[PDB]
Scaffold this motif. Structure first.
Motif: not given
Lengths: 495, 495, 495
Positions: B181, B213, B215, B217, C198, C200, C202, C207-209, C244
């Motif tokens: 990612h 994904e 993003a 972070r 989307y 997102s 972090g 960590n997700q989306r 987003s």
């Protein structure tokens, strides 16, 4: 001349119990409480036959694998039998979301009514009749799951589907649908044309949107593609809505949950035999008379409690004896109508008369403790079938550990209650026998001599009338004192 | 003149047991059954050494973190030791799917053989040698997981990869791969160019497709990107197929599950010492002689049962006593070759001779009940290590509750069995002592007088020959009646 | 003339215990150990009031449903009360990820401090004030969750958001956000314009989306759209970053976990009453004096152990008796200052004097065993509240099975310990009474005659001075032998 003894029962018994102290203790009277025989057949629970899935699995049945038979009569079942490694399951490969959760929902379920939500002729804008595969032979022709539809493009067109079913009934409705994952991008266009599609479902409770996952996979049952299925329970007065631009495996029939209750999924490779029982295990049924068995730990119905033991015998009578006149020497084979009694030895009598005042009270205290020990285990742990997938191993262990964990306990409890209360029983007889002695000794004082071997000899002269009186607790010292006094000193200055 | 007493043992013992009724009951003979000593070292199980992961975690080991040592000899292990908070794990940040499920699979696993499925030189169409990072120093240079490959675009090209490995061996194959990612969309093009990519895996059983994904972070170990890994077990005669257009972290080596059996993941911050044991706990090994310990509840191997108790002592001999002639007064310090005996007091004797007819039977009934009480807990609950993630807390609790739940039980069972059967033992001696009295009393009737303190005095004259006869149950009243008769009336009209 | 008897207590007691052998055994002295009364109110735990959510659920509270009251004072709670089917929850429909895991985190949580991470005025580039809905009335106007923001496009523009919060405090921070799923593609453009968006998130750990799932769904609370929420716990010295391009439901307030400890989520439809207790159950509080209750199995605080039993009574005194002179005949109603004693029957005395040497030792051995039996169940299983979702049924069962499984055990343990040790108590009195007899019999030998009914008559002449000596174990046979000798032969040649 003219004696009397205190003694107990002894007979042709050879059944033996154990205790904490001793083992293999031969006794007069004991009851086995362990069932360890089973008939080896698969039978119905009190008139209510199981659902025998045969070589099929739960998925094949509910999806309607062309090899699995459907159940047109809407039968009620007491349980469901599914072989260990069932041969007719997902005939077309793929996955089946939350399968285990759904098997678990069968367990509280007793009857289905298949109803047709979306008839096959109502797919006006698509080709419903062509979705079949070599993966799914019926009569050796290529076919498909009999309860879902493999929608396919018509005239090279796939109008975006939007369709709904309002749940107009009282039962919960069980609904299954799926999506198709093709091999290569060409196969997607070959079947649905729309390059990017999706399959969307909406209810009051569950909302999801699945996208096809195109990848190269080994030929399973001849197919390198996969089809994965979903399920959900549609509540009364609710409504489900699918819509898709492609790849949509559609429902035709829904299942109506009409009877919820006590059921289970038994895994046994047995088939049904004209046969009925109150208790069933995957290896055979059970004679549910004794309160404990050691046959199988997954037993369903009106069953005795399962323990891990080779044997489990209570103790009710005294331990067996030749052992002559006197309890110090052992049992009297001669008594039959009691557990404790005496021996006359009169000028005109022989002997052997039981003390029913204390036998009946003892037959009442043991047998009243025997059934009561059984009732102390009604709330005993009973195991329940459950299933888990290759990524749920941890909670599979935990389940085993917990269930094995309780069985090991209640086995120990039950063993201990037998072992202990068995010694408490035998120690009762010893106390009861020795107590009958005192009822006599306390009542015949100087009128007789304690011989030591548990017998008495009268300095007085008894007789049959006198010798039905201290048995009953009516013998009078003053009535027989003077003669006893005189004969007593006769030996004080005798030979 | 010329007496005799019934009395029991008493000696320099000071070990004390407890019961339901009393506490700190000084006795003559008792056995400790609780181990509560441990050596404090980390040792091997009966010749078979553990896998000591050192500062590393399971992930770092199997992924090949440049800081974690690999195990080139394919060693067999009895267990695996991993520090609590291991410092060498995911050196490059990210996630590790179903890690806990996989740690659980180590527990039934004893030996791996690393095999090379996809060699590094066989990535013709990509740049395999450049995937490294500051997150992963080997000798302070930037490196990477030694068992996977960070594929990177060649000449600014990334040909869609499609590659397969047929499992040509008998063992189950353990296979790990991952996906990357990136931080921003620019970093994606910087590394793989194809703006939208995916990573697809296909076997007979597992089919998935992962999309990157992207993003922003926080910098973890210097990296704001994340790399998450997947695993699956490839069956014999099966085949896995990856294909991706980018972001694909590739396997080079697979792990061959060659020995399945009894193992575990012990969390201990100990290191190995040249040392062997039959029982191991995270804090030290155990002298597995006594059937119970209280050291640690996670003990593995041929171990005694863990209970939560400060002490656990059985009772085998009588309770200790000066206490003069007579059991009413207490123990006789003088006896040594028995638990119950007598005291002669002859014209020409002294005393102290044991009744071996009843001591041996008692040494046989207790010691036969002592080992038997141990065997009643073989099926005692043993706890098993398990791990759960920050979103699995509920089943973490449940596991604890269940395991704590059984320990609290079997602790109670074991305590109760000691407390109860200890009182049953002492009450045996009291009953045995008082019973030896009757064997005598019943047999010496008028020939002597019951002094009351538990001793007898003969109106007859005994002698050493006579005084080895009622000990054996051979003394004859008729043989000594007339003299006893005559001396009896001598006092009836004496002074 | 001039007798003496051994006898025991008997009084106006009618409370009855049970044993393994007998039932409803009337005794002189017994203690109830089962609480089965509750006050029916919802009360505070030792000064610390619960969080009473009223008609609201946990979600509505923490999201700030306009109908749910917020807790501006940062109160500490001992527990949290939530009705069974709470009416104010997700006012705008949708889902709430890992809700159960999060309810579980409340249970180890005692105080929150709401803090404002992202103020509403700081959404410069978007329209924060317009996200409201009919689904969410405050004062009957359309409103929205008071702790999140429904971001909406400004001037038909939605600049891609990138925003971060560094956790600058010591407590763990609880953070909730969500995403919006619209009905049709037009509604997406109507609200956010960017066709594909989307959301997102972090942190160092999560960590997700999330991508919006557009589908057609039934009108729930007037809305065919859905909004699903996420949560995570931000560690100290960490930082979360959202970004987003649309559909982003934003946090304004975060929750600070300031007090972790013993708490729980009780489901009771009770409301608070000015009232305090040490033990609380969903139906009422508990008088935590007795060590066992049968009220509710989810009891929290300083509680007695819950067992499934109708009654649980110990046995401390002997069983009750008119029963004349002699223990063979029954209890003496006349004694009051002891459990065992005698009856004088002197030339100048009457009777009734207790043996305090053995009553006090018996009052000491039972009462010391009574509290000790209580302490044997301190580590008894206590159940803990837990919650599971419609796809977690299997582990819901497992939890029930486990908890029901331990309750059934400890109920059995407790019943058995009462039943057994009750018989051990009564058998003590019988043994104690019969033992007091021997202390006398052993000490008054030929000086008296054993009448048999448990009484003695002196051939000697006692007197009040003599009759305070064998009670104390000081009576001397030699001191009274000659008179006893002479009166003994007086009847040997009497009438």
């Amino acid at each position: 001349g003219d004696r009397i003894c205190i003694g107990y029962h002894a007979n042709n018994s050879t059944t033996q119990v154990d205790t904490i102290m001793e083992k293999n203790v031969t006794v007069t009277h004991a009851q086995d409480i362990l069932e360890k025989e089973h008939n080896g057949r698969l039978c119905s629970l009190k008139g209510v036959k199981p659902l025998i899935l045969k070589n099929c699995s739960v998925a094949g049945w509910l999806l309607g694998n062309p090899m699995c038979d459907e159940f047109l009569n809407a039968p009620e079942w007491s349980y469901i039998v599914e072989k260990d490694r069932p041969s007719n399951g997902l005939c077309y490969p793929g996955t089946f979301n939350y399968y285990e959760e759904l098997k678990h929902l069968m367990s509280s379920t007793n009857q289905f009514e298949k109803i047709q939500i979306f008839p096959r002729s109502s797919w006006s804008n698509h080709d419903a009749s062509s979705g079949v595969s070599s993966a799914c032979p019926y009569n050796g022709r290529s076919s498909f799951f009999r309860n879902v539809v493999w929608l396919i493009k018509k005239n090279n067109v796939y109008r975006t589907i939007t369709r709904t079913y309002n749940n107009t009934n009282i039962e919960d409705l069980l609904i299954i649908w799926g999506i198709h994952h093709p091999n290569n991008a060409a196969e997607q266009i070959k079947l649905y044309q729309n390059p990017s599609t999706y399959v969307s479902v909406g209810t009051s409770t569950l909302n999801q949107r699945s996208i096809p996952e195109i990848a190269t996979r080994p030929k399973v049952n001849g197919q390198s593609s996969r089809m994965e299925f979903f399920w959900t329970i549609l509540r009364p007065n609710d409504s489900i809505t699918f819509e898709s631009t492609g790849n949509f495996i559609a429902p035709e029939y829904a299942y109506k949950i009409v009877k919820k209750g006590d059921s289970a999924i038994m895994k046994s490779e047995l088939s049904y035999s004209n046969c009925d029982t109150k208790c069933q295990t995957p290896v055979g049924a059970i004679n549910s008379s004794m309160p404990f068995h050691n046959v199988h730990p997954f037993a369903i119905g009106e069953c005795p409690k399962y323990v891990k033991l080779k044997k489990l015998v209570l103790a009710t009578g005294l331990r067996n004896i030749g052992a002559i006149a006197g309890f110090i020497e052992g049992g009297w084979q001669g008594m039959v109508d009691g557990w404790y009694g005496y021996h006359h030895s009169n000028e005109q009598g022989s002997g052997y008369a039981a003390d029913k005042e204390s036998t009946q009270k003892a037959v009442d205290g043991i047998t009243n403790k025997v059934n009561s020990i059984i009732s102390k285990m009604n709330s005993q742990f009973e195991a329940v079938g459950k299933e888990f997938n290759n990524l749920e191993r941890r909670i599979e262990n935990l389940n085993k550990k917990m269930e094995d964990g309780f069985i090991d306990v209640w086995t120990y409890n039950a063993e201990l209650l037998v072992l202990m209360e068995n010694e408490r029983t035998l120690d009762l007889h010893d106390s009861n026998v020795k107590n009958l002695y005192d009822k006599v000794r306390r009542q015949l004082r100087d009128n007789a001599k304690e011989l030591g071997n548990g017998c008495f000899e009268f300095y007085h002269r008894c007789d049959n009338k006198c010798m039905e009186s201290v048995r009953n607790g009516t013998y009078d010292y003053p009535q027989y004192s003077e003669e006893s006094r005189l004969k007593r000193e006769e030996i004080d200055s005798g030979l």
